[PDB]
Ligand binder design. Structure first.
Ligand SMILES: O=C(NC/C=C/[C@H]1O[C@@H](Sc2ccncc2)[C@H](O)[C@@H]1O)c1cc([N+](=O)[O-])cc(O)c1O
Ligand SMILES: [Mg+2]
Length: 213
């Protein structure tokens, strides 16, 4: 049993099928109370929701699926006909994400790509009938944000107005990506300050009273 399997099982057991909000809430309860996990969480999630609603993207690319928390969060706000493509290098994570999406009833809107982003990005247009992306959500390995952004550009996947939205730019941090975008006339940047997910960290004091030998 892995932590990610335990999250999925908790959702199947407690959340309402076909109800994306319920799924998100079940994931957030489990990770808040039982086991920390690197889902974006509800605080940053609300910012994502606001951005998605602003831009109403027809084609979104997610880098890093993990347990599918963000895929559920985004796909539930997509308009009819819109699509989310999500890249995930770990087959166990890809499997969990697909079951999460299935449970939430969002499977028709989302396509899971199994592989490393650096290998998949160049295949997007031909294999998945993509012209340019409306939005990209970055939340995979932090050292991949910058090289993948450069690859997206190279592959002709960015248009004027494509919205990149990156998690964890403060903690754990993405310093090369953040410096790059903030310094580049090719990007207009805005920072949305929030909180790292699930940080009510339990610790305690042990009192041990010596009784003699
Ligand atoms: O490390 C973090 N995220 C990495 C996530 C990685 C996800 O994406 C792929 S990697 C990949 C590679 C190539 N192509 C696709 C996916 C992994 O298999 C996992 O599904 C992280 C860490 C913390 N934290 O506090 O430690 C907080 C967070 O919010 C985080 O997102
Ligand atoms: Mg993250």
């Amino acid at each position: 049993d892995t932590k990610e399997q335990r999250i999925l099982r908790y959702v199947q057991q407690n959340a309402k099928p076909g109800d994306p909000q319920s799924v998100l809430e079940a994931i957030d309860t489990y990770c808040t109370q039982k086991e920390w996990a690197m889902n974006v969480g509800d605080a940053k999630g609300q910012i994502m929701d606001a951005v998605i609603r602003e831009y109403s993207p027809s084609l979104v690319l997610e880098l890093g699926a993990y347990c599918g928390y963000s895929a559920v969060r985004m796909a539930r706000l997509l308009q009819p006909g819109a699509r989310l493509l999500t890249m995930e290098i770990n087959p166990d994570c890809a499997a969990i994400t697909q079951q999460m999406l299935n449970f939430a009833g969002l499977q028709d809107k989302v396509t899971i790509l199994n592989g490393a982003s650096q290998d998949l990005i160049p295949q997007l247009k031909k294999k998945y009938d993509v012209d340019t992306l409306d939005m990209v959500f970055l939340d995979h390995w932090k050292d991949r944000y910058l090289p993948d952004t450069l690859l997206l550009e190279k592959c002709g996947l960015l248009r004027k107005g494509t919205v990149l939205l990156a998690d964890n730019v403060i903690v754990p941090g993405t310093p090369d990506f953040l410096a790059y975008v903030r310094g580049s006339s090719s990007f207009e940047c805005t920072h949305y300050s929030s909180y790292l997910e699930y940080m009510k960290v339990v610790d305690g004091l042990e009192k041990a009273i010596y009784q003699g030998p």
